[PDB]
Write a protein that binds this DNA or RNA. Structure first.
Ligand SMILES: [Mg+2]
Ligand SMILES: [Mg+2]
Ligand SMILES: [Mg+2]
Ligand SMILES: [Mg+2]
Ligand SMILES: [Mg+2]
Ligand SMILES: [Mg+2]
Ligand SMILES: [Mg+2]
Ligand SMILES: [Mg+2]
Ligand SMILES: [Mg+2]
Ligand SMILES: [Mg+2]
Ligand SMILES: [Mg+2]
Ligand SMILES: [Mg+2]
Ligand SMILES: [Mg+2]
Ligand SMILES: [Mg+2]
Ligand SMILES: [Mg+2]
Ligand SMILES: [Mg+2]
Ligand SMILES: [Mg+2]
Ligand SMILES: [Mg+2]
Ligand SMILES: [Mg+2]
Ligand SMILES: [Mg+2]
Ligand SMILES: [Mg+2]
Ligand SMILES: [Mg+2]
Ligand SMILES: [Mg+2]
Ligand SMILES: [Mg+2]
Ligand SMILES: [Mg+2]
Ligand SMILES: [Mg+2]
Ligand SMILES: [Mg+2]
Ligand SMILES: [Mg+2]
Ligand SMILES: [Mg+2]
Ligand SMILES: [Mg+2]
Ligand SMILES: [Mg+2]
Ligand SMILES: [Mg+2]
Ligand SMILES: [Mg+2]
Ligand SMILES: [Mg+2]
Ligand SMILES: [Mg+2]
Lengths: 105, 147, 75, 187
RNA sequence: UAAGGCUAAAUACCGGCACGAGACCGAUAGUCAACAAGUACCGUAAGGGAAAGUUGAAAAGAACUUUGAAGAGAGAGUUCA
RNA sequence: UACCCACCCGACCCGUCUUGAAACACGGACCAAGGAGUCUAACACGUGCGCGAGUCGGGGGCUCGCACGAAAGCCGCCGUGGCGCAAUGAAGGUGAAGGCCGGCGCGCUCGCCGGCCGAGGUGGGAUCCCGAGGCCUCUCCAGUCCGCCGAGGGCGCACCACCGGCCCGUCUCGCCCGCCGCGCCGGGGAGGUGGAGCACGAGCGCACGUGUUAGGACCCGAAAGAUGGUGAACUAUGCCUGGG
RNA sequence: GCGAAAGACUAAUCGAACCAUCUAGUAGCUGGUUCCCUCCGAAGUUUCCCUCAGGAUAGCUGGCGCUCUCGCACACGCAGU
RNA sequence: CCCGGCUCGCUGGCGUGAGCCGGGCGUGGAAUGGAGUGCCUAGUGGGCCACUUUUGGUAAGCAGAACUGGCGCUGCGGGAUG
RNA sequence: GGUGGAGCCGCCGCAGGUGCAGAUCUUGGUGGUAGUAGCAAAUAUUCAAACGAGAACUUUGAAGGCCGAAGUGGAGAAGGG
RNA sequence: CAUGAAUGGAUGAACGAGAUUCCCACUGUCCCUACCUACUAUCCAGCGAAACCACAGCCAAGGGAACGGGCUUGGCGGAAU
RNA sequence: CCUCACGAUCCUUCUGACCUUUUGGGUUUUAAGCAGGAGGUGUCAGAAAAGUUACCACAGGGAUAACUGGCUUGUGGCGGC
RNA sequence: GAUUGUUCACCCACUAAUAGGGAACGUGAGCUGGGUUUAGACCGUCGUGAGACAGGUUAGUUUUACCCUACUGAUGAUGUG
């Protein structure tokens, strides 16, 4: 029963929400489960970039994110036989290899 | 808190703020926005004019990134640049007209609102307004397009 | 289940409790509702008052100095 | 056996700041003193403002403070705002000002000092001009809040344009029965 | 680049094993269940399903005398009580 | 004042629905303990606080085995992003400035070139400023200090009323166009009208209150509907085999 | 299902069994709705509704304020006249 | 209110008219009282009675309106009781 | 003041499952009714003794009686355990 | 009003815990009640419930939610059973 | 001559602009828009809708009947001038 | 007294007369249960049908007093040493 100049308010609670409510009291303990892994992995591969292999420079697709630059998935193949690094070897020297990137420029 | 709630001050008050003539029954009007046409019309029609009915043209699978286009007014153009590059002008006796890359500050369009300081400029943007053209031109300066 | 059908019983009380207010009228009421050929003209009269301000300003000093002379001739 | 309406005999105005900030309660202790004593209605307005709410003593932009000090004659006086001085990025020729305020945003604080100006607080203003001599009282636009747009007659009553509350504006959100003459009617 | 296939990691856990904690409840509350509780008990059966915590610090839990068929008493004694 | 008793006056039993209850209206033997406007989300306005054309906050990250910690602190993360900073159209799309002066096109209320000012004006406007004149002061006069009163005169916030102006949609009407192209090209004008618009801003976040909803939703209350199951030990028939 | 037919009977249950769940089903309708003091204080009328035991909107109510006025020898404004 | 003057694409033999700028002038019947304005918003939406007016009805403690006043929301003195 | 035997409150802030006379409220307890209604379907008991603290009601003896072999008699099924 | 032919019409021996009417016989059904018996109730020993209950319990009239126990005015009122 | 002679959303159709979209470009169909008319809701602010229950059920209602009681007294009865 | 569920009615007979009424249209924990007014049935009419019928017809559970009062009887009661 509306009264005097509110909004229209379609709120989505008709279905059954009480059952599938996901509370986040794990949140601060998950911060810690990941932190140990992040550390335990760095100590396991001791001399190695903890962040992981090297990713390539890459531009974002749509016209609104035109001008930014990202870390891509992996260096392309066409890139590699210019620098002279065999595609199967680079996977073993910390170079992400993406065999799926069409180079246009 | 429960401490500062009118439900405390309604103890010993029989009807509990809901009146004993017409009690607080469960759902007297309806449930939710129900009855816009029927018996709630006076509300929907006098407070939400234009609610009920179709209009316009469907455009299925719209994506916002296609039509993304922020705007600057000339009101605040010399804000995008550090003000010292403006002070290192109106001076320098050479017609320096520093370059303002409206693209770098995140705007794909320059609109002509407000006064502009009497100062030469080069404004690089994507889409210009007509009056924003004349305001920059007439101050002395260029409008340079970028893709 | 018959019921009363109408009444204006204590209605006079209600709408006189906040004391029926004659609508507060300002000077300069709105021109909305006046025939367009009036406005479509009187806006041109108002738009070009300035063209002819020189006549108005000098002719103001004429009477301002003639009545500064009229009040000084009385003195 | 008397016949007055006690409906609105009690006058509803603030006689103390509803807030607890000891600082505002302190210079209220100052103009609870000046207001009773000196003939100046000045502080009687300053006092009657130190009570009011955030929503009722709006911020004064810096440019609206210029064009109210540029007027012919009010040169040499001090601007006095029971409120905050904000900055105005769309203004550059900052004349030298003497301002008083409760707060001054940090950016506007440096535009004012750099222009050879001075900012006081409402206790140095009490020592400058306890009578309020040579001052200018100002305020921001109280009909400035976006709230004031949803107020008025109603949206949907004849030619009374007032913004309606809509969860999100768009094509299909309230352009229908009542807005286009083609679909029902329009007002 | 379909019509064939394999794959760790972040992801989920009101069952289970083993723990830790609490601005929680405190015996009509908190789980039905602080106890021989999914027990006693009902129903042909599917199923239903309780009540019920506290002597004292230590049993030192009242020997003995007496009245009574006996239950119960009167004295005595134990006890900080 | 509270225990018992006495007297004079008063005095019908509470809760409830109700035009009307002491009611020949209903609930109520008595006493203990239990017992009913809650939380979440979403708006809205009011209020407090931080910062302020910005401001966050989340998720992440960097710092612990937590005792207090599953806290606190910190991070071009702080802006990826939301909300705000700009509207208007169904949409292609456009998009908030005017004034003035001089000069040049025939000042043609049209088009172009140089300079000045910059958010227009009217009426109220808290109200500050200036203030004629007074009002004394132990003398006649002179005269600088100090205020009180102060006719009259000025700037004029906020806000309200109005007139203008600009943006977009639509219409009308009419003019000149620019020319990387050709004009079923694009561009400007005047007048009216639609707009949740601009016309030197006020938001963001965090609290608390009130209200409205969606939620079991202030507590208790149906006759029903659905999905799976267990029953012929009673009784209803049929059958099989016995007994009277 | 079964009925030599009464809607009979189907484990004290039959115009449609019992058990658990969906389930805190829905209720414009009954019933209840827990401490004091202080200040203000109504309505049963308007239009629309498959509206007539209900809502929507009007009023009437309160709270919050604000804008000013001047009893500070120096007031405009309003009104159930 | 009274003068003076500008503006017009309307109106017209001229003037109208309206709009502007600029000056010139104060208590305009009695009695009362500080006024203006914006936000949220609960309850209510079964009513009843009396003077007077009045519609059905024969009449009603009947049905239905007007105007005010009450009762509901409210005790006290009086009407024995209400 | 008393009994009671181990913990508790004042102030400044924060948080609630926070105040009961009532709901044919829930659970438990207890009255008035009241020492009242009642212990009335199938004819029936009596004497003496024994035992015993205690006998209308047990046991033995004696007497009167009923069930009357389509049984209140003698044996089984199902069921009970 | 509004019968009627297998929505069967008309008949009808026997039969009926089927519905009526009349007569004979009979009778405590009645005029009109009376007494007799058994078991009760009744009192006692023993044992002992329940429904129900705002507070409660003498009337007339008045008013009143238009039939009071309570209120107004009268009438009156004597423990425990 | 004046005061009545009429109709929302959605949907459908017709008409209008060398209109806009038809989605990676381009051309044609087609469809979707925009602006006006029409197709209709007579319960006329606009549900797509027949019964019966004496086998019945639930929520309620003295807001709504069938008894009594009140007020009234036409009618009925009784009585005057 | 005859008929009738009847109030009402009509007659027979007697008489002095067979006047009219109230008491919740007196009186169901006083009776009876014939009539209405459940469920079974039967006809007529109506209804396409389920069914309807102040149209007939037959069959159809009538609970509780021990409480207070009133009343009827029954003991008593304060006073009178
Ligand atoms: Mg990573
Ligand atoms: Mg109250
Ligand atoms: Mg209530
Ligand atoms: Mg594959
Ligand atoms: Mg216990
Ligand atoms: Mg306990
Ligand atoms: Mg328990
Ligand atoms: Mg114990
Ligand atoms: Mg205990
Ligand atoms: Mg002790
Ligand atoms: Mg009533
Ligand atoms: Mg009564
Ligand atoms: Mg009731
Ligand atoms: Mg269904
Ligand atoms: Mg009701
Ligand atoms: Mg009501
Ligand atoms: Mg009535
Ligand atoms: Mg102990
Ligand atoms: Mg708690
Ligand atoms: Mg309690
Ligand atoms: Mg025999
Ligand atoms: Mg044997
Ligand atoms: Mg007896
Ligand atoms: Mg294609
Ligand atoms: Mg039938
Ligand atoms: Mg039947
Ligand atoms: Mg009634
Ligand atoms: Mg009657
Ligand atoms: Mg009777
Ligand atoms: Mg009786
Ligand atoms: Mg009876
Ligand atoms: Mg009968
Ligand atoms: Mg029958
Ligand atoms: Mg027949
Ligand atoms: Mg037929």
């Amino acid at each position: 029963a509306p009264s005097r100049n509110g909004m229209i308010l379609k709120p989505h609670f008709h279905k059954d929400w009480q059952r599938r409510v996901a509370t986040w009291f794990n949140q601060p303990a998950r911060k810690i489960r990941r932190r140990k892994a992040r550390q335990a992995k760095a100590r396991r591969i001791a001399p190695r970039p903890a962040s992981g292999p090297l990713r390539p420079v890459v531009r974002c697709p749509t016209v609104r994110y035109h001008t930014k630059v990202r870390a891509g998935r992996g260096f392309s193949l066409e890139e590699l036989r210019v620098a002279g690094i065999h595609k199967k070897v680079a996977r073993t020297i910390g170079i992400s290899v993406d065999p799926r990137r069409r180079n246009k420029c | 808190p429960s401490r500062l709630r009118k439900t405390r001050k309604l103890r010993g008050h029989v009807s509990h703020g809901h009146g004993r003539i017409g009690k607080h029954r469960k759902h007297p009007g309806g449930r939710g926005n129900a009855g816009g046409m029927h018996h709630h019309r006076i509300n929907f029609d006098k407070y939400h004019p234009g609610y009920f009915g179709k209009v316009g043209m469907r455009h299925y699978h719209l994506k916002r990134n296609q039509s993304f286009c922020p705007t600057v007014n000339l009101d605040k153009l010399w804000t995008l640049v550090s003000e010292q590059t403006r002070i290192n002008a109106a001076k320098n006796k050479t017609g320096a007209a520093p370059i303002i890359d409206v693209v770098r500050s995140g705007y794909y369009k320059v609109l002509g609102k407000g006064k502009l300081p009497k100062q030469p400029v080069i404004v690089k943007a994507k889409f210009f307004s007509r009056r924003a053209e004349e305001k920059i031109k007439g101050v002395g300066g260029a409008c340079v397009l970028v893709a | 289940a018959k019921s009363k059908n109408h009444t204006t019983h204590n209605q006079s009380r209600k709408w006189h409790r906040n004391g029926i207010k004659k609508p507060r009228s300002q000077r300069y009421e709105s021109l909305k509702g006046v025939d367009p050929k009036f406005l479509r003209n009187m806006r041109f009269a108002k738009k070009h008052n300035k063209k002819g301000l020189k006549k108005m300003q000098a002719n103001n000093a004429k009477a301002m100095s003639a009545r500064a002379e009229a009040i000084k001739a009385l003195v | 056996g008397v016949d007055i309406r006690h409906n609105k005999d009690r006058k509803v105005r603030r006689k103390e700041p509803k807030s607890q900030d000891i600082y505002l309660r302190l210079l209220v202790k100052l103009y609870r003193f000046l207001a009773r004593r000196t003939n100046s209605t000045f502080n009687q307005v300053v006092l009657k403002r130190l009570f009011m709410s955030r929503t009722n003593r709006p911020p004064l932009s810096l440019s609206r403070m210029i064009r109210k000090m540029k007027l012919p004659g009010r040169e040499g006086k001090t601007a006095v705002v029971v409120g905050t001085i904000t900055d105005d990025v769309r203004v550059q020729e900052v004349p030298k000002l003497k301002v008083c305020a409760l707060r001054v945003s940090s950016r506007a604080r440096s535009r004012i000092l750099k222009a050879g100006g001075k900012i006081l607080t409402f206790d140095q203003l009490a020592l400058d001009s306890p009578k309020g001599c040579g001052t200018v009282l100002l305020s921001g636009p109280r009909k400035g809040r976006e709230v004031y747009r949803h107020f008025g007659k109603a949206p949907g009553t004849p030619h009374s344009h007032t913004k309606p509350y809509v969860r999100s504006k768009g094509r299909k959100f309230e352009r229908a029965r009542g807005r286009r003459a083609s679909r029902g009617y329009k007002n």
